């Protein structure tokens, strides 16, 4: 099993520090347990979560080498996927809660009736299956980088750099998994299936948004600019 090269350890170093620097708290000791009225309470806590994703991308030099319109398309595509993964890895099976913004435990029913519908089930079921994966800050960071460097986002111009960047991350993230030897069979194939799950979540946020569009003014401006 090939383990990371020197250059790949450096990439891992960059993406892991970028993730840690933009990941709220570090949470189970801050949790503040919790219908446009539920939708309002959720819309008005989302703009910090979107901004942390923007700060994570800006700490990746490969992302900064892209033109600003490709940068915009890339955040718009992966914002909910990254925010969903960050909430899913903070699933507490004892309270059956996800942690939003590092300090807000939410339930399956609270988050569903807050506006996400069946996407709430998808994120919660993802958090359940991610418990036995035992992902660290590095594996989560690399997952976020793979989702961010999706060359199939509509409108992109540098399709072929973006797909090269992703192939870099994908290889360093597979070698890290080889180096790390999880006690789960066919781990790398199963992780790629989780990338598919998060991409499904990203496109289902989009369908739920069109369903929610309530006066657009009641939606916060960055929430509108992502969708």
């Amino acid at each position: 099993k090939p383990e990371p090269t020197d250059e790949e350890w450096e990439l891992i170093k960059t993406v892991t520090e970028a993730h840690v620097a933009t990941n709220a708290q570090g949470w189970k000791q801050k949790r503040k347990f919790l219908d446009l009225e539920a939708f309002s309470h959720f819309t008005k806590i989302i703009t910090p979560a979107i901004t942390r994703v923007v700060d994570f991308a800006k700490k990746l030099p490969m992302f900064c080498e892209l033109p600003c319109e490709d940068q915009i398309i890339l955040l718009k595509g992966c914002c909910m996927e990254i925010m969903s993964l960050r909430a899913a890895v903070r699933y507490d099976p004892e309270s059956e809660t996800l942690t939003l913004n590092g300090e807000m435990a939410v339930t399956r029913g609270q988050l569903k009736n807050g506006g996400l519908g069946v996407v709430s089930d998808a994120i919660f079921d993802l958090g359940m299956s991610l418990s036995s994966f035992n992902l660290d800050d590095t594996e989560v960071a690399l997952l976020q980088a793979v989702l961010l460097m999706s060359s199939d986002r509509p409108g992109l111009a540098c399709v072929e750099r973006i797909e090269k960047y992703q192939d870099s991350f994908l290889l360093a993230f597979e070698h890290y998994i080889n180096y790390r030897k999880h006690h789960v069979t066919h781990f790398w194939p199963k992780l790629l299936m989780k990338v598919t799950d998060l991409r499904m979540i990203g496109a289902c946020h989009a369908s739920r948004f069109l369903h929610m569009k309530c006066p657009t003014e009641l939606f916060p401006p960055l929430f509108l600019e992502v969708f």
């Binding site: 923007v54 600003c68 915009i72 955040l75 401006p221 960055l222 600019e225």
Partner: peptide, 11 residues
């Protein structure tokens, strides 16, 4: 459009 997002990206 995308003015707010573009501000956050252009530092």
């Amino acid at each position: 459009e995308n003015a707010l997002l573009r501000y956050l990206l252009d530092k």
